[PDB]
Design a protein around this ligand. Structure first.
Ligand SMILES: CCCCC/C=C/C/C=C/C/C=C\C/C=C\CCCC(=O)O[C@H](COC(=O)CCCCCCCCCCCCCCCCC)COP(=O)(O)O[C@@H]1[C@H](O)[C@H](O)[C@@H](OP(=O)(O)O)[C@H](OP(=O)(O)O)[C@H]1O
Ligand SMILES: *[C@@H]1O[C@H](CO)[C@@H](O[C@@H]2O[C@H](CO)[C@@H](O[C@@H]3O[C@H](CO)[C@@H](O[C@@H]4O[C@H](CO)[C@@H](O)[C@H](O)[C@H]4NC(C)=O)[C@H](O)[C@H]3NC(C)=O)[C@H](O)[C@H]2NC(C)=O)[C@H](O)[C@H]1NC(C)=O
Ligand SMILES: CCCCCCCCCCCCCCCCCC(=O)OC[C@H](COP(=O)(O)OCCN)OC(=O)CCCCCCCCCCCCCCCCC
Ligand SMILES: CCCCCCCCCCCCCCCCCC(=O)OC[C@H](COP(=O)(O)OCCN)OC(=O)CCCCCCCCCCCCCCCCC
Ligand SMILES: *[C@@H]1O[C@H](CO)[C@@H](O[C@@H]2O[C@H](CO)[C@@H](O[C@@H]3O[C@H](CO)[C@@H](O)[C@H](O)[C@H]3NC(C)=O)[C@H](O)[C@H]2NC(C)=O)[C@H](O)[C@H]1NC(C)=O
Ligand SMILES: CC(C)CCC[C@@H](C)[C@H]1CC[C@H]2[C@@H]3CC=C4C[C@@H](OC(=O)CCC(=O)O)CC[C@]4(C)[C@H]3CC[C@]12C
Ligand SMILES: CC(C)CCC[C@@H](C)[C@H]1CC[C@H]2[C@@H]3CC=C4C[C@@H](OC(=O)CCC(=O)O)CC[C@]4(C)[C@H]3CC[C@]12C
Ligand SMILES: *[C@@H]1O[C@H](CO)[C@@H](O[C@@H]2O[C@H](CO)[C@@H](O)[C@H](O)[C@H]2NC(C)=O)[C@H](O)[C@H]1NC(C)=O
Ligand SMILES: CC(C)CCC[C@@H](C)[C@H]1CC[C@H]2[C@@H]3CC=C4C[C@@H](O)CC[C@]4(C)[C@H]3CC[C@]12C
Ligand SMILES: CC(C)CCC[C@@H](C)[C@H]1CC[C@H]2[C@@H]3CC=C4C[C@@H](O)CC[C@]4(C)[C@H]3CC[C@]12C
Ligand SMILES: *[C@@H]1O[C@H](CO)[C@@H](O)[C@H](O)[C@H]1NC(C)=O
Ligand SMILES: [Ca+2]
Ligand SMILES: [Ca+2]
Lengths: 386, 146, 25, 240, 195, 195, 23
């Protein structure tokens, strides 16, 4: 509630020369912001040194601090420290409280130094992913024709693995490959629970694909649409998406889309992978005509960002639902990133409601600002069962 | 002891023994070689151009660091007179002369044993551009002169 | 483009500075 | 003029082709493949009318007519050849543009004029060959099997740390670190530029007399056997 | 001649990150010089007469440059952006400085000789293109679509016709032809069966 | 005699500044480099060497006019290339960023199978066409044929005045280079040789 | 047992922007 209210009253200033931003950047030993030096007293209930005076901020390595977006985000999130302190005072036995931004940064309390190179990204975390959208029925079409041989095949494999890394036990996934003939890349033949074992099997299967043949989009899309109408097996009965991985084609396949999803009940996200000179027009048309989105992955450095942005599109019906789409969910048991043991995380999404007082913007207010998170250690639960 | 492997060249010298049968080839080769031996002073001028440019390059770019992955390295440098001459011949034929030009311009990490801290100048812009003009021209003057 | 010391192919011409000699920019 | 237009259209079609790896094909290539019978039929008709107007072994007296006849014959064989051996038969189509040289006599005159100057040069070429062989043999006696040693870490999976030849405790390039000058490594340029036999030596000497990458071979020989005497082989080869 | 020299000097000061004042000054000077040259051309054509004006081979070049400059001006006005680069060709008129010298006859007879052989040079230049197109097609048949045996396909490939003809041109210039030879040999397969 | 005076006096000054501390090391280096004029004294000492030098000078004087024409044409091409390519030879150390304001901070570099953090810095290519002198230098290097495919790639990938490269954005611009190769290294060099 | 809360195919969804129109 406080995050929504504070962000609603924001100005989006374009310069930060004299209006410095004061915050404690984690993992430290630029013009536009100031830095905080904390005291870092040793405290129990944490295995590290913490400071209750303010909140720490983590910004991923490949995201530049001091840009306009990150500086505006820091300025409007500087008002969360008061509620962090109030929550800590109302219940001393409280662990990490975190705001994960769609910008990329995470502001967490109490302030602690961050834990080689750091590859942590807030938007890839299980709690952020479960709070950013609803369960899904992902189906991945991989183009394995002759034209994808080379580096645009290893990029496709890496991208498919990274996108499988974004699924959980509530999501159901399958992978199919087509070259003038569509077939499953593994032994599954239908959507599976997408747990650790099934994801490992799918990753091993997709690492073994070789490229040869001629692309036929109609057959692959017919296979994909038929795989989503099984209903003989356990599914999620929620978001149904087809995630196509190609380089570039010439066929739009209007007949398949018209026949199967006539009412556009299934989204189609499309990815153009590699450095090539094929036509991207049909790919973007297929993305636009089926509530989907078009992405470009030309290198390894673009794989991580582009394989997680599809959760922005899936979050539109959740923000449009209103306050009914605000339910505290709890993750599976996982090891805390800041070395705290086994924890579960409570999750609540945060909506952008600037201009919703008069209800006039409705343009970028259909995306989430970020995710609330609070950690509960399994020792806390064990203390309640003598 | 001292190597004695050059004698194997001797049995390879018998090919010239079959060069007699090229009545048209032999006379052409002899005529051009004899013309070459009639113009030694133009060759001396070319050698003097090489000598002057090698000395200038030795003085100006001699103490560039021999760091590899650049065009001045353990194979192509200005460290010695013979190395400078080899660099000049490589540029005269033309292999990466623009790369060698870029490898010594006013901001090169300088040699450890060198007494200076900033070695390498922007004279290379002239140094390499004039040479490619001069050498070639002299060569073109030599060829016609034959 | 590829940085100094990175592995390259001569026929790609994708070194930021210098040439691709002996397989390294 | 209609035949020249057909030849120009065929050249445009041959320019419109696209090639993809691992057996992939664009739909436009499939569309363009259908136009081959029309061109073959028109060429056969144009070459059929000349046979009943000049005879044979006089229609076939002209060399350009012979080239036209072989082009159309290979086209006909390719159309009727369903067998797997057509790669060397489909390559004849690249001579189809040359047909428009036979259709414009001015181009034939210009070609005769330009080739009139290449007859005295042939002897020069012979001399050039005599040079290359004469150096290749020398390169066969000094640099044969010298680029196969390389710095390998400690015999784990045969990954050379560097792409340069090394020498075993000699005035050559000693291995740096804890690597060793082990036996067998393909070579510098995928193992193509070497002096293993007379054919490789001939190829590398020819590649060295065009002043293209000869310094790389010089440096390889320098770091494989010492830089004391290598120049004496390469400076004359460039000079002569 | 002084007007042409001033135009050359002003068009030659164009550099990256120049002051805006210089950009506007050159923008207006372009119109001023184009108008001056247009008036000079019209005055000369009215004086000498159309046929007499086009009699000289040098005035035809000036007329072509003037019409190309007008086309470039209108093109850039209706679509601000790239520049064809035709108003610089007026600097060729500066060659008329050779008239007052004693080397006009030699310089002018070479162009008279050149222009007398437009047919032969065109035929020779089109015959060189004809053989560059035959070799590009042969390379397309040989190594067409077979250069993906490594990380990425090189810029020097034989997949399309523009790429193949540009590769053949680069080989003809002699630069890095041995690298393309190595890459094609590896494409045909190894040093054993691909030589 | 002037030559001899400068080579004698030049060393004199160096000796005068040598008997003290390191005064004006730049002038010390300049006067030491000036010592290379020692062999040139032989030009007039040997009559045959003077004769061959005079022959070289006469050969240069016989072609100075075509040299001037060649320089004018190359200046025109340099101005055209400056108009075409100025400002478009900038790049970011990671290819994902196409603007200077985005080329700031750290980025993940995937080399030697170990991701590492590298600074994100906005740089410029070695050979560009920012002004007419840089264009002349680049075109001279192209005319020699050394590394001209690299500048061709940089010119094709050029997008706009302050943007990073985009692969194969303008292939048609290669026409420029092809035309250049048909003029200076093919035609002008051959007329130099023939003259 | 899966979650009983599903949010999809909302009528008021914009969906007028893809990744190709902007780029
Ligand atoms: C292999 C392919 C590569 C070829 C590239 C090199 C192509 C050519 C490269 C080098 C050749 C040039 C050599 C030297 C050039 C100029 C030095 C002097 C030559 C020269 O000026 O003669 C011109 C040259 O015409 C041009 O095209 C003006 C210059 C334009 C030439 C370049 C045009 C662009 C290329 C052609 C494009 C197609 C159009 C032709 O001579 P002209 O026929 O105009 O001669 C008259 C005649 O002498 C008149 O008497 C005289 O007037 P008076 O003084 O009253 O007698 C005329 O002068 P004015 O009327 O101006 O007073 C002269 O211009
Ligand atoms: C929650 O939603 C609200 C609106 O629903 C959103 O507020 C909007 O923020 C954007 C900033 O992204 C403002 O945009 C103004 O107008 C343009 C558009 O970006 C900017 O000008 C340049 O635009 C280019 C893009 O083409 C950009 O690259 C560049 O950096 C911009 N600046 C330059 C060139 O200096 C303006 O700068 C920008 N700001 C102004 C004019 O102050 C919208 O005006 C905002 N809308 C409203 C109603 O306030 C808000 O950001 C969302 N919340 C979060 C956390 O993102
Ligand atoms: C068209 C006409 C063509 C013919 C005319 C032009 C030919 C000129 C080139 C001739 C060859 C010159 C030498 C080339 C090889 C250079 C030597 C080399 O690379 O190897 C070094 C060699 C031994 O090396 P390595 O194997 O390391 O030693 C044992 C290791 N413990 O170390 C040695 O001991 C090698 C000694 C090399 C020769 C010494 C000097 C010879 C002088 C030659 C004068 C001109 C040649 C006249 C004959 C021409 C050919 C018949
Ligand atoms: C027809 C057209 C003609 C056109 C061209 C005409 C002009 C040509 C001008 C000269 C051409 C270039 C000559 C190149 C010679 C280079 C020699 C060389 O590189 O020698 C290498 C080797 C060692 O050199 P260095 O670095 O000093 O060794 C360090 C450890 N001692 O050196 C040695 O060990 C030296 C051995 C003796 C050398 C004597 C000379
Ligand atoms: C985003 O950044 C802004 C600038 O860094 C912050 O805005 C500043 O907040 C200050 C206190 O919160 C203001 O100081 C006083 O503000 C009151 C409000 O009406 C007024 O009395 C005066 O403006 C001022 N009093 C003084 C100076 O004695 C700043 O005026 C105000 N603006 C600036 C500095 O330009 C925002 O608070 C910040 N947003 C969040 C959420 O923290
Ligand atoms: C055709 C005849 C008249 C030749 C005349 C020479 C000028 C056209 C040339 C030579 C000097 C060149 C100038 C000398 C050097 C430079 C580089 C540059 O100067 C700068 O200091 C800005 C560069 C920066 O700060 O980034 C701007 C172009 C300028 C002055 C050049 C523009 C083109 C100039 C004016
Ligand atoms: C001796 C002379 C007469 C022969 C010179 C050969 C030229 C006619 C060839 C070689 C280079 C070819 C150029 C090489 C590459 C290109 C780009 C290409 O344009 C495209 O259509 C590419 C666009 C795309 O597919 O993305 C064709 C024109 C051009 C410059 C070609 C036109 C024909 C050129 C100029
Ligand atoms: C299970 O899925 C199949 C197809 O994936 C559905 O289709 C029937 O499959 C069974 C299998 O023998 C047969 O009845 C017919 O071949 C199919 N058609 C019909 C009309 O039955 C099937 O309905 C699904 N459900 C079940 C319980 O099998
Ligand atoms: C005969 C004439 C044309 C010789 C060429 C003279 C010009 C181009 C040369 C002569 C000496 C050169 C200078 C020598 C040393 C340095 C120091 C270096 O840190 C920056 C470049 C700078 C300042 C050079 C710039 C270019 C320079 C001035
Ligand atoms: C013959 C010489 C001396 C004068 C004519 C040469 C100049 C003016 C001509 C020759 C070929 C021309 C190029 C041909 C094609 C293109 C592609 C276009 O999209 C941009 C301009 C550009 C790059 C032209 C620029 C002007 C150009 C370089
Ligand atoms: C590692 O290298 C050393 C010397 O280079 C050698 O003695 C040793 O046997 C090597 N290791 C193995 C496992 O062979
Ligand atoms: Ca395909
Ligand atoms: Ca070269």
């Amino acid at each position: 509630l406080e995050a929504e209210k504070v962000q609603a009253a924001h100005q989006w200033r374009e310069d930060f020369a004299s209006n410095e931003v004061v915050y404690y950047n984690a993992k430290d030993d630029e013009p536009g912001s100031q830095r905080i030096k904390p005291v870092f007293i040793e405290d129990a209930n944490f295995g590290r040194q913490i400071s209750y005076q303010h909140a720490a901020v983590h910004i991923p390595t490949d995201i530049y601090e001091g840009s306009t977006i990150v500086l505006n985000e820091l300025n409007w999130t500087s008002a969360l420290d008061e509620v962090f302190k109030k929550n800590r005072e109302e219940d001393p036995s409280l662990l990490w409280q975190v705001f994960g931004s769609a910008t990329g940064l995470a502001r967490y309390y109490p302030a602690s130094p961050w834990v080689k190179i750091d590859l942590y990204d807030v938007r890839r975390r299980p709690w952020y992913i479960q709070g950013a959208a609803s369960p899904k029925d992902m189906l991945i079409l991989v183009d394995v024709s002759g034209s994808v041989s080379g580096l645009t095949l290893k990029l496709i494999r890496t991208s498919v693995s990274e996108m499988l890394e974004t699924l959980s036990d509530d999501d159901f996934v399958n992978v199919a490959s087509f070259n003038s003939n569509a077939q499953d890349v593994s032994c599954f033949q239908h959507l599976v629970q997408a747990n650790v074992r099934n994801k490992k099997v799918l990753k091993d299967a997709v690492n073994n694909i070789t490229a040869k043949g001629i692309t036929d989009y109609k057959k692959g899309f017919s296979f994909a649409f038929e795989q989503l109408l099984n209903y003989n097996v356990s599914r999620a009965n929620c978001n149904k998406i087809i995630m196509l991985f190609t380089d570039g084609g010439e066929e739009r396949a209007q007949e398949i889309f018209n026949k199967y999803n006539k009412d556009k009940k299934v989204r189609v996200f499309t990815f153009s992978v590699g450095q090539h000179n094929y036509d991207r027009g049909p790919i973007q048309w297929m993305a636009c005509e089926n509530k989907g989105y078009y992405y470009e992955i030309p290198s390894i450095g673009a794989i991580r960002i582009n394989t997680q942005e599809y959760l922005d599109v899936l979050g539109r019906p959740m923000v449009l639902a209103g306050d009914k789409a605000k339910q505290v969910q709890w993750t599976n048991v996982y090891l805390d990133a800041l070395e705290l043991g086994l924890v579960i995380t409570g999750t609540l999404p945060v909506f952008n409601i600037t201009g919703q007082f008069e209800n006039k913007t409705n343009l970028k207010n259909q995306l989430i600002l970020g995710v609330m998170g609070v950690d509960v250690s399994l020792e806390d639960i064990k203390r309640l069962t003598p | 002891f001292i190597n004695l492997s050059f004698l194997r060249l001797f049995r390879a010298a018998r090919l010239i023994k079959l060069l007699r049968q090229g009545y048209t080839i032999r006379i052409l080769l002899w005529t051009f070689v004899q013309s070459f031996k009639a113009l030694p002073y133009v060759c001396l001028l070319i050698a003097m151009l090489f000598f002057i440019y090698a000395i200038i390059g030795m003085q100006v770019f001699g103490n560039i660091a021999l760091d590899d992955d650049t065009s001045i390295n353990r194979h192509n440098n200005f460290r010695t007179f013979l190395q400078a001459l080899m660099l000049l011949f490589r540029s005269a034929t033309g292999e990466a002369w623009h790369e060698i030009m870029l490898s010594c311009l006013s901001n090169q990490a300088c040699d450890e044993q060198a007494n200076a801290t900033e070695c390498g100048s922007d004279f290379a812009y002239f140094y390499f551009v004039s040479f490619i003009f001069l050498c070639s021209f002299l060569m073109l003057n030599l060829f016609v002169a034959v | 483009c590829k940085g100094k010391g990175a592995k390259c192919s001569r026929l790609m011409y994708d070194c930021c500075t210098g040439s691709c000699r002996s397989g390294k920019c | 003029y209609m035949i020249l237009a057909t030849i120009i259209a065929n050249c445009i079609v041959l320019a419109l082709e696209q090639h993809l790896p691992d057996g992939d094909k664009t739909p436009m290539s499939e569309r363009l493949d259908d136009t081959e019978p029309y061109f073959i039929g028109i060429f056969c008709f144009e070459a059929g009318i000349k046979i009943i107007a000049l005879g044979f072994v006089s229609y076939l007296r002209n060399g350009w007519n012979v080239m036209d006849f072989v082009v159309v014959l290979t086209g006909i064989l390719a159309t009727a050849g369903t067998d797997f051996d057509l790669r060397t038969l489909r390559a004849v189509r690249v001579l189809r543009p040359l047909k428009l040289v036979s259709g414009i006599p001015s181009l034939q005159v210009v070609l005769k004029s330009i080739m009139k100057a290449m007859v005295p040069l042939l002897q020069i070429g012979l001399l050039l060959f005599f040079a290359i062989l004469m150096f290749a043999i020398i390169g066969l006696e000094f640099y044969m099997g010298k680029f196969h040693k390389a710095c390998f870490p400690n015999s784990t999976d045969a990954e050379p740390v560097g792409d340069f030849p090394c020498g075993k405790e000699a005035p050559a390039r000693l291995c740096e670190g804890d690597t060793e000058c082990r036996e067998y490594w393909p070579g510098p340029n995928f193992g193509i530029t070497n002096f293993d036999n007379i054919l490789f030596a001939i190829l590398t000497v020819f590649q060295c007399i065009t002043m293209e990458g000869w310094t790389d071979i010089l440096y390889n020989t320098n770091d494989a056997a010492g830089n004391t005497w290598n120049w004496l082989y390469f400076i004359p080869l460039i000079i002569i | 001649l002084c007007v042409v020299a001033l135009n050359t000097l002003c068009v030659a000061m164009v550099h990256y990150n120049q002051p805006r004042r210089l950009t506007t000054t050159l923008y207006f000077a372009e119109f001023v010089f184009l108008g001056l040259f247009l008036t000079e051309m019209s005055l000369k054509m009215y004086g000498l007469g159309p046929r007499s004006y086009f009699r000289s081979s040098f005035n035809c070049f000036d007329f072509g440059v003037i019409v190309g400059s007008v086309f470039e001006v209108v093109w850039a006005a209706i679509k601000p952006g790239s520049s064809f680069g035709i108003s610089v060709l007026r600097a060729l008129r500066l060659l008329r400085i050779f008239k007052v010298t004693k080397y006009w006859s030699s310089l002018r007879n070479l162009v008279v000789s050149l222009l007398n052989s437009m047919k032969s040079i065109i035929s020779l230049l089109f015959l060189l293109f004809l053989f560059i197109v035959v070799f590009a097609l042969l390379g397309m048949q040989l190594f067409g679509g077979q250069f993906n045996f490594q990380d990425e396909t090189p810029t020097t490939n034989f997949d399309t016709f523009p790429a193949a003809i540009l590769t053949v041109f680069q080989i003809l210039t002699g630069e890095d032809w041995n690298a393309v030879m190595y890459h094609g040999i590896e494409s045909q397969g190894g040093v054993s069966k691909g030589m | 005699n002037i030559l001899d005076f400068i080579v004698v006096s030049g060393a004199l000054v160096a000796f005068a500044f040598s008997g003290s501390k390191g005064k004006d090391i730049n002038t010390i280096k300049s006067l030491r480099v000036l010592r290379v004029l020692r062999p040139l004294k032989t030009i007039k000492r040997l009559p045959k060497l003077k004769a061959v030098f005079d022959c070289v000078v006469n050969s240069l004087k016989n072609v100075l006019n075509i040299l001037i024409v060649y320089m004018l044409f190359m200046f025109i091409f340099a101005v055209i290339a400056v108009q075409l390519f100025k400002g478009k030879f900038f790049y970011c150390t990671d290819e994902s960023k196409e603007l200077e304001r985005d080329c700031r901070g750290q980025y993940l570099d995937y080399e030697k199978e170990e991701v590492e953090a590298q600074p994100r810095q906005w740089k410029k290519y070695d050979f560009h066409y920012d002004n007419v002198l840089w264009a002349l230098l680049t075109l001279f290097t192209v005319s020699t044929g050394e590394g001209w495919p690299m500048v061709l790639k940089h010119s094709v990938d050029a997008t706009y005045e302050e943007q990073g490269p985009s692969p194969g954005y303008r292939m048609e611009l290669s026409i420029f280079y092809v035309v250049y190769f048909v003029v200076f290294p093919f035609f002008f060099v051959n007329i130099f040789v023939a003259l | 047992k899966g979650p009983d809360v599903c949010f999809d195919n909302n009528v008021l969804e914009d969906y007028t922007d893809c990744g190709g129109v902007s780029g």
